[PDB]
Design a protein around this ligand. Structure first.
Ligand SMILES: [Ca+2]
Ligand SMILES: [Ca+2]
Ligand SMILES: [Ca+2]
Ligand SMILES: [Fe+3]
Ligand SMILES: [Fe+3]
Ligand SMILES: [Fe+3]
Lengths: 166, 510, 388, 388, 71, 88
């Protein structure tokens, strides 16, 4: 069964998710999933066609479990892993402002999303972080945006040039 | 006791004072710019007066549509080719209108001056208006036209084809994903000021020429709202002109915005105009040069020169790649006709003459290919032939630009032909130009859009069409067709018999 | 020329003939209903639904979306154009919401335009009839100019609290509702100023400048906690649903309803003021219109979601508790305004009864819908502490 | 069929080709302005004038007519279709009149339609917002249902007073204004009933039947002189101008403006009533609208007629004195209504202040215009004598 | 506190009782016939609903005239 | 200036208002409107369309929508006097 909106892969993950019955287990699985299947730094591209949808189903489970496990204060101010959200935010922003270049910066921002995207971190803190981290990342990236030649930029990104046509 | 009242300008006089200061009174979105606290707006409107002026326009518009136009059977007396073009033109513009809603909501959040916020707000409402207007054109043609399919379900059937992906880049994500200022450039400074404003008018011309009086009635009304949006974009540059960051980033964001918009609209608009019509208004090449070069790239952009704004650095390459781009693209759209939500046609004899006349050398390249496809029976269901097969037999792979989503065939294209293939962290990426290539290399995480070949890999064509509802109400006939005639329409079975299975063309590389 | 140069295919003999020749004998599909695939909320699909539902190009990974795949261009860092990460609430389908008034752009501006013209006629007949003569000077120059005036900033702040939702709403139907709820708020703020400007015309010496009302809002005591709450709802809330829900189902339902209806509308008539009540009638009609939409989205669709009902109620209860405190504080500071009135205007019993009316309507229209356990006498007692 | 069988000359290739071939190269006259021969009242001719002036086919023997000869068919006896004999007033031109609001049918129904829809939204907000709670049970069940309702028959009577003018008016501009003055009156009467019908829907025991309010009007003491005056202006006046002038520039300017404004509107609020004032706002906006027309016709046109100024003023001064007495009497009988108000509601000081407001306005807007020297004190005292 | 209103019919319901009897309550025009004072009308309209239904027709009409037809 | 106008006034002006109100009602609603105007208005739009005139149909068809009510008034006029012995 291979389809765009419904297929065996998605079915298999729905089953896997139905078995995550505790917050800590579910939250850890979600973070692991993001490390393995999201962003250009994902560990592999095997689930490229279904990861977005699967991730959302995983998020759904972590959210429902967190709401049942946390008291009202913690639901607003703590991450699914029990960390103080404000501390994590301030700490990550601090690192961002200390970033020496656009390469260090993109690692910080991308890594932050992979580890803390809701329902891990409360949305209010996460989007406040998106606001601050994204600002610095752009500032570093858009400075002298064209000065580096493509030949050299390809090397900086670290791509393998497979085929070039002119 | 002399009858008196109060008008919009009398209240707007104090609108600027509505905002007040407090620690956290700041934008929630990331940006490299600082919009001036005292930036002002060009039009002095208030909610009530905004509503009144739009309501007046609505009465004329809907009155014309429901009364005279319906009595004249205007929804039917349009050329078959134009009825199809509007399925794409109206639904695609609809998404641009829709995203512009979220886009201006974000600009409104960015602006710190009450007046500048108000200018953006008026646009947010206008974009909801425009979404609903574009929706009404499809709604009207579906209700009263010669072929409702596609007009009646484009919101889900557009997802089957490759042309839709690029549309979301320039008129969806390009409008709301990134620095608010970058988004403003994509939407207002370039999107509308360069393409939308002139396009909307041009569309009403081609429409009238092909018997369509429905679109002129709605779009001419949409056009009356654009002036204010032009000012918003212009005021955006003003609000950030006196900021040190402006001189450091403005031109870079502008150049990217310019290439993004042009990369998609240069070939797609010209294609819908020249290939989606019977009666021609003007050759796309000259229409383009006037819009992009003369009007925008010179007059409109020159004015903002005193704010640091310069002419896009990719402008020259954009021109060199324009001339043939739309011709190159129609070859692909027709070859992949089964993936659409509209009916396409081969150029007729009179059209080929017009093409050759206006684009010397058109016949020796495209003309001959179309003639060949006709001979292979591309218009006939029992032929068992789809132009795609021709690309395979002749080793002409079709790639999808990872950044713009625009399809391209480098080995066949008369315009650009610079394919770049990279491998990064276990994934292959294909680019068609040096500008989009830089975009991905610098911002890999912004461009991870999976293309149709990646999503459809290993799938039999008819299965994809069926799953995504690309069928007419009889549950057998395809919405998309390779000809615009009333008989001999292809069914899902005709496609299944072709046993066409998608393959990711990039997997051939080692 | 009389005929012009541009030939039109609908009327031009030659072109029309070519067009008619290419037409099919009958439509190529008998299904002439745009949006036929949309699940109708009511008996038959409405024009509102057809023109709105699925206009937002969401992929299936955002609940209810019909498209597939990632966005074509995301934010630096990777944030999606629209995504589940922008709100704590979850649902089986973000496209289920329906504005009970079925307002798409045309009907929306039509009604507001009618109200605008009615308003103009009203003011002309009001000034021509010289009704301003019977209005108490103190009430006019103190309570309407300064205190009713200051409230414009409250409505303005609530208007701004909608900016992020305009950008982040996860569906067309929610975006349109949210946009209209917000637009009605800026309208009210502008009508408060409109009234002041009208008074400056028919009353010698009445200054329409906002300096005074603004100084009251920014530095006065009566609206101090209201302003602190508004500043929070607007700028400290990044979740688009927390924002809309807390504004309409908590703050404006309690504080706003009290100020507009139990203070100004209730006392204006006692001072010969038939002017302010005219504008408050509009604000209240707008409030009741928004309430229907807010109830449908948060209670009908989210709070009663077949899969996330329990989860969503827990979240909304959380938000209610979070914002009820600042709202009580706002009402508490506002109680100070009663001491400014001329002796004999109203008394503690009337004030208490009016507070209970607002709290009881709130418990019925909102709190009870998510099982929030509100204690009406405890809420009222906390507010009354502000009476000087 | 998809194309239909009917061929249209604008779109049919063959027919359109024939039509195009017959057209002149350019318009056969450059004067594309309909009504260009009409004398503009303002800078440029208005749509209102172009579409209205001279529609009435009067011959030159009726001041202003452009036609010639007698009518083609008259009444048995010889009475002309329209003639100078139907009114005492004389003029150099019956087409001089101009409604200051320039209302022809389109703008007229547009404005009223907006009000109808505004009204519907208002009532829906009022009810949903439970504003009825602040409504004093006595006031609504006794003063609105009986006395406010009974007044509807007063407006209904003034309405009917316009019937003869609808037939005898000597010009289009006057016929249109007249028709609108009377139509607005029936509207008011119907709005009084609507409010009573609304109350019936939101107040369990409230009965909307006109039984009560009618019995009062027919067999009552408060409006006894009122009804008698109405019956006169309506069924005893055979002069269309006397009927319109006396009704609008005398009876309704005094009695009507007092009963509507200085009583129900001035006191409704005091009893927690913002409903009745909503509708009175309409009646007053309508009153101020008709007033601009009544003034233009009887003062700016007839009263200041280049040849009959004195004559007409004499006729109007005469008419004034004729109906001023029956009006003053209508007021007296109305005074006895205050005695039924809960003690403390209002004192003789206010009742006197209001009376003077009405009388004064009447003098500044009407009396002083035809030089009908009237004594404010004598009038007020004559009415004040009714206070039982 | 459910949203409520009143339509033309609900008001027209009592329209017939609007007229009251008295002295000269009769036609001012010569006639040989006598119209029953209990005669009913087929359409239950009030001034405000009448205006609305006609304003809607006007919109279409003038809209077609000023826009499409002029174009 | 012309003679055709005189006859028009006779049927659509004086015939409508000069005489017993009931006779005027018959000239206007029972005959004029029910017998001639009602069909006429529609016929005019038909002849208009055939000759390229889309203006008249837009206006006249809207006027037509109002005739149903006027038909009733005329019909109700006869019902109103059907009991008066003068009728027969
Ligand atoms: Ca390899
Ligand atoms: Ca304090
Ligand atoms: Ca008491
Ligand atoms: Fe737009
Ligand atoms: Fe725009
Ligand atoms: Fe008629």
């Amino acid at each position: 069964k291979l389809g765009i909106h419904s297929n065996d892969t998605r079915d298999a993950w729905v089953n896997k998710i139905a078995q995550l019955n505790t917050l800590e287990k579910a939250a850890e699985m979600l973070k692991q999933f993001r490390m393995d299947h999201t962003t250009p730094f994902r560990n592999s591209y095997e689930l490229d066609n279904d990861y977005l949808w699967i991730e959302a189903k995983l998020e759904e489970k972590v959210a429902v479990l967190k709401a049942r496990a946390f008291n009202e204060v913690d639901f607003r101010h703590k991450t699914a892993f029990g960390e103080d959200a404000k501390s994590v935010l301030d700490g990550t922003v601090a690192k961002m402002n200390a970033a020496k270049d656009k390469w260090e910066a993109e690692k910080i921002h991308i890594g932050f999303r992979q580890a803390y995207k809701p329902p891990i971190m409360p949305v209010n803190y996460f989007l406040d972080g998106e606001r601050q981290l994204g600002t610095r990342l752009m500032e570093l990236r858009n400075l002298n945006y064209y000065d580096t030649p493509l030949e050299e930029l390809r090397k900086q990104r670290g791509v393998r040039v497979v085929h070039l046509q002119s | 006791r002399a009858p008196t009242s109060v008008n919009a300008q009398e209240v707007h006089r104090w609108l600027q004072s509505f905002n007040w200061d407090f620690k956290n009174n700041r934008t929630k979105y990331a940006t490299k710019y600082k919009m001036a606290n005292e930036t002002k707006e060009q039009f002095k409107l208030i909610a009530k007066e905004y509503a009144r002026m739009e309501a007046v326009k609505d009465e004329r518009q809907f009155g014309s549509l429901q009364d005279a136009l319906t009595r004249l059977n205007a929804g039917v007396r349009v050329h078959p080719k134009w009825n199809e073009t509007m399925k794409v033109v109206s639904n695609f513009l609809e998404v641009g209108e829709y995203n512009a809603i979220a886009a201006t909501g974000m600009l409104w959040d960015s602006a710190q001056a009450a007046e500048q916020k108000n200018g953006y707000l008026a646009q947010v409402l206008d974009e909801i208006r425009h979404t609903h207007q574009c929706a009404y054109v499809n709604y009207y043609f579906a209700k009263n036209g010669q072929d409702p399919a596609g007009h009646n379900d484009a919101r889900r059937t557009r997802t089957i084809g490759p042309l839709w992906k690029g549309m979301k880049r320039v008129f969806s994500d390009g409008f709301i994903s990134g620095d608010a200022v970058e988004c403003s450039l994509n939407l207002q400074l370039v999107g509308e000021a360069c393409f939308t404003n002139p396009l909307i008018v041009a569309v009403t011309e081609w429409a009238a020429a092909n018997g369509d009086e429905i679109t002129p009635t709605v779009f001419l009304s949409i056009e009356t709202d654009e002036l204010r949006h032009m000012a918003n974009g212009y005021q955006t540059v003003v609000s950030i002109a006196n900021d040190p960051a402006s001189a450091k980033y403005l031109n870079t964001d502008l150049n990217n915005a310019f290439w993004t918009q042009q990369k998609y609209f240069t070939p797609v608009l010209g294609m819908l105009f020249e290939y989606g019509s019977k009666f021609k208004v003007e050759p796309w090449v000259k229409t383009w040069d006037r819009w992009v070069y003369e009007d925008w790239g010179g007059i409109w952009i020159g004015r903002l020169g005193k704010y640091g704004v310069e002419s896009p650095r990719s402008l020259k390459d954009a021109k060199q790649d324009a001339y043939w781009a739309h011709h190159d693209l129609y070859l692909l759209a027709y070859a992949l006709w089964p993936t659409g939500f509209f009916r396409l046609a081969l150029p007729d004899q009179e059209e080929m003459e017009w093409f050759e006349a206006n684009y010397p050398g058109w016949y020796d390249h495209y003309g001959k290919i179309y003639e060949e496809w006709r001979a292979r029976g591309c218009e006939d269901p029992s032929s068992g032939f789809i132009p795609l097969m021709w690309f395979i037999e002749n080793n002409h792979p079709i790639y999808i630009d990872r950044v713009s989503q625009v399809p391209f065939c480098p080995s066949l294209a008369k315009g650009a032909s610079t394919l770049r293939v990279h491998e990064y962290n276990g994934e292959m990426h294909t680019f068609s130009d040096q500008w989009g290539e830089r975009m991905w290399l610098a911002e890999p995480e912004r461009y991870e859009c999976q293309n149709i070949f990646e999503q459809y890999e290993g799938r039999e064509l008819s299965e994809v069409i069926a799953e995504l509802h690309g069928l007419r109400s009889d549950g057998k006939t395809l919405i998309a067709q390779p000809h615009v005639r009333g008989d001999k329409l292809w069914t899902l079975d005709d496609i299944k018999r072709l046993n066409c299975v998608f393959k990711n063309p990039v997997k051939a590389f080692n | 020329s009389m005929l012009g140069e541009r030939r039109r295919g609908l009327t031009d003999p030659e072109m029309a003939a070519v067009i008619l020749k290419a037409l099919p004998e009958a439509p190529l599909d008998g299904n002439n209903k745009m949006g036929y695939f949309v699940t109708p909320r009511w008996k038959r699909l409405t024009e509102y639904e057809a023109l709105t539902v699925y206009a937002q190009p969401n992929a299936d990974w955002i609940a209810g979306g019909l498209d597939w795949g990632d966005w074509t261009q995301k934010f630096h860092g990777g944030r999606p154009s629209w995504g589940n990460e922008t709100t704590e609430l979850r649902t089986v389908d973000w496209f289920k919401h329906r504005d009970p008034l079925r307002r798409w752009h045309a009907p929306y501006v039509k009604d507001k335009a009618e109200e605008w013209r009615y308003t103009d006629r009203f003011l002309q007949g009001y000034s021509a009839d010289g009704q301003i003569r019977a209005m108490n000077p103190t009430w006019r120059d103190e309570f309407i100019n300064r205190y009713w005036g200051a409230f414009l900033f409250n409505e303005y702040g609530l208007f701004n609290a909608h900016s992020q939702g305009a950008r982040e709403a996860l569906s067309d139907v929610t975006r349109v509702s949210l946009a209209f709820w917000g637009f009605d708020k800026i309208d009210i703020a502008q009508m408060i100023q409109l009234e002041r400007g009208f008074l400056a015309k028919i009353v010698p010496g009445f200054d329409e400048s906002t300096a005074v009302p603004k100084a009251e809002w920014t530095n006065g005591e009566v609206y101090k906690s209201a302003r602190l709450a508004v500043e929070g709802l607007w700028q400290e809330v990044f979740d688009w649903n927390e924002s809309a829900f807390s504004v309409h189902a908590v703050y404006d339902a309690l504080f706003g309803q009290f100020v507009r209806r139990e203070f100004f509308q209730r006392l204006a008539p006692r001072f010969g003021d038939n002017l302010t009540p005219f504008f408050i009638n509009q604000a209240q009609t707008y409030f009741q219109i928004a309430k229907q939409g807010v109830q449908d989205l948060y209670y009908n669709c989210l709070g009663d979601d077949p899969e996330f009902s329990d989860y969503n109620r827990t979240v909304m209860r959380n938000w209610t508790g979070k914002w009820l405190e600042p709202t009580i504080a706002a009402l508490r500071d506002f109680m100070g305004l009663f001491a400014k009135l001329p002796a004999g205007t109203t008394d503690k019993e009337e004030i208490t009864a009016s507070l209970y009316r607002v709290v009881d309507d709130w418990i019925e229209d909102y709190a009870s819908r998510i099982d929030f356990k509100a204690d009406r006498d405890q809420i009222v007692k906390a507010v009354l502490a502000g009476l000087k």
